[PDB]
Amino acid sequence: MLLIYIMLSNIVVLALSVVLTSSPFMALMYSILLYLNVQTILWSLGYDFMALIYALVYVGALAVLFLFVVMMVRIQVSTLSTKTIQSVLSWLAIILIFSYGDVSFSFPCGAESLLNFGTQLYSSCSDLTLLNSLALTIALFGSLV
Amino acid sequence: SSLFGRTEVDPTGKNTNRNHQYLYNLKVLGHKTYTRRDPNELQKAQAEVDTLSAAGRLGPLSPF
Amino acid sequence: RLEAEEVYTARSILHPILQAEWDLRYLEHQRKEREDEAKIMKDVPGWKVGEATSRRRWLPPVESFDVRPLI
Amino acid sequence: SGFGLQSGTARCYDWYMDYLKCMDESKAPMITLRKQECSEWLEDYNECLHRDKLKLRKLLIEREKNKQEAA
Amino acid sequence: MWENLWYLDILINVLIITIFGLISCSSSATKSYDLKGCFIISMVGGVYDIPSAILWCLASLSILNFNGFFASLFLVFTWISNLFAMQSLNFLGIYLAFEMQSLCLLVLGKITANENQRWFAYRGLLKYLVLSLIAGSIFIFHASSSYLQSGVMISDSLVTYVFLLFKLGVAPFHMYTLELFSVVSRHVAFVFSTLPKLSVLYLISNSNIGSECVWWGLISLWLGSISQYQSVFVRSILLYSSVAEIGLVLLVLQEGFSWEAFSWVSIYFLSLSGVWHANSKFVSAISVASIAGLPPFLGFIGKAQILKSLVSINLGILIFSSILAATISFIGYLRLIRLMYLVSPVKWKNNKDSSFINWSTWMLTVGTLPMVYSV
Amino acid sequence: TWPKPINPYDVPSSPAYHRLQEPSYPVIDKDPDFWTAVSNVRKEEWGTTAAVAAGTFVMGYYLGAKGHTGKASAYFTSFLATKSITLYHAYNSADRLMGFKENSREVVKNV
Amino acid sequence: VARVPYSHELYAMAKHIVFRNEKEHNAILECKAQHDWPEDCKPESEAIVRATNKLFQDIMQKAPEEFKDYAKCLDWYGLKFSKCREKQAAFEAAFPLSE
Amino acid sequence: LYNAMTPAQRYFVEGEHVVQAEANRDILFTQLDSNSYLPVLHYVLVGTALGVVFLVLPLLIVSFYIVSIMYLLFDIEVVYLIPYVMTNATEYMYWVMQTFVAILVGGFFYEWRMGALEWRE
Amino acid sequence: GTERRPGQSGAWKQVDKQRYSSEWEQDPTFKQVPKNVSEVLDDSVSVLFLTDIVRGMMYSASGFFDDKVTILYPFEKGAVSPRFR
Amino acid sequence: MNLNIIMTVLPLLVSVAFLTLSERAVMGSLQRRMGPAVSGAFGILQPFWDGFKLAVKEPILPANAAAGIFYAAPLICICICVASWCTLLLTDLSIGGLFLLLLSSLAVYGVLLAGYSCNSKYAFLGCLRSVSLMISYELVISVVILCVILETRDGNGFPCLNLTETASQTKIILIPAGLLFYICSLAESKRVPFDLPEAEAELVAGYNVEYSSLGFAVFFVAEYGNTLLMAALINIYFLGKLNSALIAAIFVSFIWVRGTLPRYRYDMFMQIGWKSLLPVALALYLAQASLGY
Amino acid sequence: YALPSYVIVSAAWAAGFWAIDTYQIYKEGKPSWNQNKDQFQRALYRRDWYLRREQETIGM
Amino acid sequence: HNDAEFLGAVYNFSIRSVFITGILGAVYWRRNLITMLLCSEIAFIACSVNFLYASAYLNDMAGMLFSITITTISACETALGLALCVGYFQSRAANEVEALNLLK
C-alpha cells in the first residue's frame, strides 16, 4: 500500500520535472522515468502485458525517435533561467485548481488474461485491430516519403 | 459489431426496430437471469439436510 | 491437450465444491456482521438491519481473495 | 464491450442488460419517456457499479459507533 | 462470416491495388489513371445507402484531381476513415476513425508541398497537429471519466458533441482550418473542407448528438461573416465562409433536419469546386454566386433548404442574425467578383485539368429546376 | 467469488460483425460455405459478372494505354471488378440460403 | 466454519468425487444455475461440502498411505497429473472408484 | 507487501493472527504472492546500489531517423501479434491474423520497392 | 572462389550497373544464371546456409589444436647468429 | 529482500571475469599463442588484476559534458544486467521472456547517453549507427520470440513464455528460429560480423572509450554479461533445461564464430537484418503460428 | 589454454544454479515454484494459505 | 477508514495533474515543438491509464482495447509530427533563430 501510494504520488513530480526543465534532452529522461512509473502503476491494477506494452512502445521505441530528433535539431536553449518563484507557484496553483474535488472511485484490482484479450482482439474486436494496422500503414507511408 | 454497424431495410417487413445494443449483447454475450427460491422450499430442503446431519449420515462441515 | 482436458475436467469438478464452501463462509461472516450492526444500531430509530442494497440481484463482494496486486 | 477481462462477462453486465430489456418492453414513443419508465433498473445498475448506498450505510454505522465509543 | 466478407473485400481491393501500383511504378505513367479507376471501382463496394453513395461520389470527384498513385491512395484512406465514422457506434469507433482521418490529412498536406513551400506548409501542419492533439486528449480523458461513471461507452454525450464541434470547425474551433488550409494545396483544402463534414453530419443525425445550446452556431455565423468582410486575402474569405455556413448548418442539424444538411453538403461541394480550382474567371464567378446563395444556380437551393428549416423551428434571434450575417458575407463575395472583373487586368495559369470543373458548373446552372421540389 | 475454470483450447469466440435478424424465409443452409453460395448464384448474376468483366477490361485498357501499360491494367481491372461483384453475388446467395432473403427459386432448385 | 480438504487432496480425490458423489454435485450445479443468492443455495452447498469431507475421511481409512503418497506427489509436481501417474494408479487400485 | 484489508479478501478468516502473518510474510510464489513484480523492483534497486558503490569508490581516493520510425511501427505491429500467439487460435482468428500480416507485408514491400530498406541514403 | 555474384559488390555505382544492366553475363569471371532447377537450389542453399563461412571455420579451428609457436622470452632466447651486430 | 539475490549476483561477477579471460585464451589458441602466464602460475587470477589495478588509476575530472548522464550510463548497464539475470533465475513471471526482451530494449539507452556525452557532430552519427544496429536486430529477436511462444504451452494448456516451461521440453521445430536467434544475439552484443564499431572507433567516433576507470569496467563487464545472458536464452528456449556447460559452450561458439569472420559495413549488416533476416523470421513466424496448435 | 577458464565459468554457474535451486526448494517447499500459474491455480494457492492460517488459529 | 477510497482519491488527483501538466505544461512554460509533442504523449498516456483503471474497476475489456488504440494512434501521430519538425528545421533560413520555438 505504501509502495502503491508512493508511485501514484511520484507520477505528478515526474510530470512536473518535464515541463520545468529547460533542456529538451533532460525532459526526455524525465519522461522515460515517468513511463516506467506508469508501468509500475499498471502493475498494481493487475496488468502485466499492458504495462509491458507501455514500456516496449514508448520507452523502447518512441523515446529513441524523440532523442534522434533532439540531437539532429540541437539548439542553444541555455539562454536564461526564467523560473522565478512567482511563476512556479502560479503553475502549481493552476494544477491544484484543475485536479481537485473530482469524482473518486475505490482503487480496483483486476486480473487480466492475454488468452481472453487475444481471443477478443482476433475474433470479436477484429474490426479494431485491422484499422489499427491500417493506421500504422498510413503512418509508415507518410513518414517514409 | 462491437464498434461499428450499418443499417438495412427489411423487404419482408417482419423484422422491426429494436435496440441494436440489446440484440448484439443477447447474440454474442447472452443474458443470465436468476430466480429467487421460495421460502417454503428452502426450509424443507434445509431441514432435510439438518435431519440427515443429526442422524450422522452426512459428513462433517469441516474435514479436520 | 489431453492433459489440458484432464485438468479442466478436474477443475470443473472442484469448482462447485469450492464455491459452495465460499458461500457458507460468507453466510456465517455476514450473520456475524449483522449481529454487530444490530448491536450498534440499537439506539438509532428507524434503522433496519439486513436491508437489501439491491432489490433483485445479489451484489457480490467487489473485492476477492483471488485477485491480489502484482506489486 | 462487457466481455469480462478473464472470461464470461463484465461484473455489472447483467444489471445493464436487465435495464435494456425493460427499455425494450416499454411502448413509449420516445427514448426519454422509456428511460423514465425504466429508471429503477438503472438505479440497480448504478448500485452495482459503485455501491454508494452501501457505502453510506457503512458511514452511518461507523459514525454512530464512534459516537457511542466517545460517550 | 459472410457479414465480415463485405468489409474484408474493401481491404483486399485496396491492398492489391497498392501492390500493383508499387510494382507498376514508372516514369511512363506518372499520372496513374488506371489505378484511379481501380480505386473508384473498389469504393463502390462500400456503398450501402444514399449518404454512403454521396460519400462515394465526392471521393471519386476528389480522386480525379489528385495526381499520382500515392495521393490517391491516401484519399482512399480518407474514404475508409469517413466510411467508418458513419458506422461508429460508441467512443472508440469515433476516435479511431477521426484520428485516422487526421493522419491522412497530415500526410496529404506534407506530400503536396514544394521545397520552397515547406517553411509555411510544415508550420501549418504542425500547428494543426498540436491543436488536434489538444482536442483528442480532452475527448479521450472525458470519455474515460464517462466510461468509469456509467460503465458503458455511449456516443450520445456532451464529450462527443464538443469533439464533433472541433471536427466541424465551429465557433471556437475553426482556427486550425484557417492556419492549415491557407498554406496547403488548393485541392487538399477543397477536399478536406467538404468531404469530412458529411461523416460528422451523419454521425450527429444517427447517434442523436444534439444540444440545446445555440450559442456556438450563432457565434460561428457572426464571427465568420465579420471576419470574412475584414479579411484582405482571398483564401481567408473562402475559409471564413465555411465557418459561417457550418455554424448555421449545425443549428439546423441539432433540430433533426438531416435531409437538408445532406443536400447542403453536396451542393456546397459542387459550389466550392470551381472557385478553389480556379482556372477560368467565369467558372469562378458562377461558383462564388452559388456559394452566396444566389437564385439562378443550385447554391440557392442548398441555402434555401437550411433557411427553410430555420423558420420551422421558429427561433427569432437566429433568423435575424442569419439575415444580417448573410448580408455581411455577401459583401465579401462581391469583393471576390470585383477582384476578377472590375479591379485590374487578370492573368492566371493555364492549368487545363478541369476534370469535373465544367461538369460542376453545368450542374450548378442546370440542377436548380430539377431539385426545386426540395424547397 | 471463485474464478470459473477456463479451457484454453475451447474458449468461446465469435466473428466480429453480426446480422441481427431472425430468418423470415425458410433456411436451406444454416451455415453455407463459399462453394455452396457460389453454386447457388443465379444465372442472371453470372451474366452480370461477365458483363462487368468485359466492360472493366475495355476501360482498363483505355486508361492504361494513356500510361503505356494497357494490357496489364486491363487484366488487373477485370480481375478486380469480377472478384468484387462475384463476392457480392455470393453474399446475396448465402443470405438467401440462410433465409434472410427471398429463396423460392433456391428451395425449388435444390429441394 | 465450512471447509473442504486442501488443494492437492482435492485433486487426488477429484476423479472419485464425480464417481461417488454424483447426486450432490448435480444438485448444486442445478441450484446454482437457477438462483444467484447464496442463501437460496445453502442446503445444497452444505450437502456437497459434507459429502466431500465424508469422502476424504473414508479414503483416509481404506487407503491412508496411497492417498497421502498421491497427494504429496501432486503437491511436489505443482498440481500436474501427468508426472504423478504411478502413484495415481496405486491409489486408484487401493481405493476403487465408482465403488 | 500488499496486505488484504477486508474479510472477503482474507477468505472470511477471523482473528488477528492472519493479519500478523500476512504483514510479516515472505514473498513466496507458491504462497500468496504469485506472478509478483515486486522482486523485480528489489533486483532493480540492488543493481543500482551496486553501481553507485562502484561509481563513488574512486571519487574518494536521415537514415537513422528513418530506421527509428520503421522500428517503432514494426514494433507496434509485433505488439499486436503478441496476443495471437498467446491463444489456442481457431481458423477465423488465424485468417484475421493473416490479413493483419498481409497489411504489414504490404508496408514492408513498399519499403523494399522504394529503396528505404537499402541504407545507401 | 574468384567468381563473383551480380549482387555482391562494394561500390554503389557498380551495384547499380549490375542491377540494371546485363553486361556482367558477358564478363567471364562472374557466375552465370543457374539455367537448371537443381543449380538454383544449389546456389540458393549456398548463399542462405552460409556454406563458405563454415569452410573457413574448420580451417581456423585447426588453429586450436596445432602446435603453438612461441618462445618464453626470459627462459628461452631466440637464435642469434655469429654475424649479429 | 532475499538471500537468492546474492547467489545470483556473485556467480555473475566471477563468471564475467573469467569470460574476459576465456576470450583471449581462445584467441591465443587460434593464433598459435598461449594464455597469459606472467600474471600468476595458474592464470585463474589474471582478470582480477585488471579490475583491481583499474581501481588504482587516478580519476579524471569530467570535461565538457553534463555529469549526471555520464554517471547514468554505467548505472543503467549494471541495473539491466542484474535485473535480467535475476528474472531469468529467480522469478515465476508468466511473460518473463518478454520482460527480458523489454530489458534488452533498454540497453539502447546506455550507448545512446554515452554518445550524447561526447557532443561531437561525428559522434552523433557513430552512436546513431550503433543504436540503429541494436534496434534493427531487436525487431528480428521479437519475431523469433513470437515463434517461441507458439510451441511453448504449459501442462494446463495455457500459452505462456515462462522460462522454466519453455525450458522443460526441447523442440527441434524451433531450431530454424534458433539459428536466427544466434545471429541476432551476435548482432546485439556487437560481435565482429556486426562489429561496425572497432573500425570506426579507432579514431574517436564515440563509444565507452570516454569512460575511464570504474565506469569503463562496468560497461565491458556488462557487455560480457549480456553475451552470457544471450547464451542462457539460447539454451533455455531452443536446447532444453538450463545447463551451465551448454551456456559456456555457446559463449565459446560466439568467440569461435567471431574469430572466423570479418566485420560488415554499416549498410551491409543493416541490409542483412531488414532484407534477409526479417523476411526469414516472418516466414518462420508464419511457419510456427502456422504450424499450428 | 581454453578449457581452464571455460571450466571456471561452467563450474561457477553450476554452483550458482545449485545454490538457487536448493534455496528456493527449501523455502518454497516444492520444485514447481517457478511454474506458470493461471487464475484458478493462484486463487487455490491463496485459499490454501488462508485456510492454513485459520487452522493454526483454531489449533491454538 | 478505507485504504481503497484513499488510494482512489490519490490516483484521481495524480492522473488529473499529469493530464493538465501534459496539455498546458509546454505552452505555459514556453518550450520548443519537441517538448510540446512529448507533453502531448504524456497526456495521452494519462488518458490511456485512466481507461485501464476503468477496465479494472468494471472488469470490462473496452478500456483495454481503447488503450491499445491510444498507444498506436499516439505513436503514429508523434512519428508524423517529428517528420514535420525535422523538415521544418531543415528549411530554416539563416536569419531565423529559434525556428522550433514558435511559442516565444
Ligand SMILES: CCCCCCCCCCCCCCCCCC(=O)OC[C@H](COP(=O)([O-])OCC(O)COP(=O)([O-])OC[C@@H](COC(=O)CCCCCCCCCCCCCCCCC)OC(=O)CCCCCCCCCCCCCCCCC)OC(=O)CCCCCCCCCCCCCCCCC
Ligand atoms: C436505379 C434505381 C435507383 C432508385 C432507388 C435506389 C435504391 C436502389 C439502389 C440501386 C443502385 C442505384 C444507385 C442509385 C442510388 C444509390 C443508393 C444505393 O446504392 O444504396 C441504397 C440501397 C438501399 O438504400 P435506400 O434505398 O436509400 O434505403 C435505405 C434507408 O431508406 C436509408 O436510406 P435514406 O438515406 O435514403 O433514407 C431515406 C431518406 C430519403 O432520402 C432521399 O429522398 C434520397 C433523395 C435522392 C437523392 C439522389 C442523389 C444522391 C446522390 C448519390 C448518387 C448515386 C451514386 C451511385 C452509387 C452506387 C452506384 C451503384 O430520408 C432521409 O431523411 C435521409 C436523408 C437522405 C439524404 C438527403 C438527400 C439529398 C441527397 C443530395 C442531393 C443534393 C443535390 C445534389 C445535386 C443534384 C442535382 C440534380 O442499397 C442497395 O440497394 C444496395 C447498394 C449496392 C450498391 C453497389 C453494390 C453493387 C456492386 C457491388 C460490387 C462493387 C464493385 C464492382 C463494381 C461493378 C461496376 C464496375
Ligand SMILES: CCCCCCCCCCCCCCCCCC(=O)O[C@@H](COC(=O)CCCCCCCCCCCCCCC)COP(=O)(O)OCC[N+](C)(C)C
Ligand atoms: C474496412 C474494414 C476494416 C475492418 C474489417 C473487419 C471485417 C473483417 C474481419 C474478418 C477478417 C478476415 C477473417 C476471415 C473472413 C472470412 C472468414 C473465413 O473465411 O474463415 C472461415 C474459416 O473456415 C474456412 O472457410 C476455411 C477456408 C478459408 C479460406 C480463406 C478465406 C479467408 C481468407 C482471409 C483473407 C486473408 C488472406 C491474406 C490477406 C490478403 C470462418 O471460420 P469458421 O467457418 O467458423 O471455421 C470453420 C469450421 N466450419 C467450417 C466447420 C464451420
Ligand SMILES: CCCCCCCCCCCCCCCCCC(=O)O[C@@H](COC(=O)CCCCCCCCCCCCCCC)COP(=O)(O)OCC[N+](C)(C)C
Ligand atoms: C442524377 C445525377 C445528378 C446527381 C449528381 C451526382 C451523381 C453524379 C452522376 C454523374 C457524374 C459525372 C461526373 C463527371 C466527371 C467528369 C469526368 C472526368 O473528370 O474525367 C476526367 C478523369 O480524369 C482522370 O483522372 C482519369 C482517371 C479516372 C478515369 C475515370 C475512372 C472511371 C472509373 C469507373 C467508374 C464507373 C463507376 C463504377 C460503378 C458505378 C478527365 O479530365 P482531365 O483529363 O483530368 O482534365 C480535363 C481537361 N480539360 C477538360 C480542360 C480538357
Ligand SMILES: CCCCCCCCCCCCCCCCCC(=O)O[C@@H](COC(=O)CCCCCCCCCCCCCCC)COP(=O)(O)OCC[N+](C)(C)C
Ligand atoms: C466494335 C467492337 C469491337 C471493338 C474492337 C476492340 C476489341 C478489343 C478488346 C478490347 C480491348 C480494349 C478496347 C479498346 C478501347 C480503348 C483502347 C485504346 O485505348 O485505344 C488505343 C489508344 O487510345 C485511343 O485511341 C482512344 C480510343 C477510344 C475508344 C475508341 C474505340 C471505340 C470502340 C472500341 C471499344 C468497343 C467495345 C470493345 C469490345 C466490347 C490503345 O493504344 P495502344 O495501347 O498503343 O494499343 C494499340 C495497339 N497498337 C498501337 C500496337 C496497334
Ligand SMILES: CCCCCCCCCCCCCCCCCCCC(=O)O[C@H](COC(=O)CCCCCCCCCCCCCC)COP(=O)(O)OCCN
Ligand atoms: C532453401 C530451402 C528451401 C526451403 C525454404 C527455407 C528458407 C530458409 C529457412 C531456414 C531458416 C534458417 C535460415 C538461417 C538464417 C539465414 C537467413 C537468410 C540467409 C541469408 O540471406 O544469407 C545472408 C544472411 O546471413 C548472414 O550472412 C548474416 C551474418 C552471419 C554472421 C554470423 C554467422 C553465425 C554462424 C551461422 C549460424 C550458425 C548457428 C550455430 C553456430 C544474407 O547475405 P546475402 O547477401 O548473401 O543474401 C542476400 C542475397 N540477395
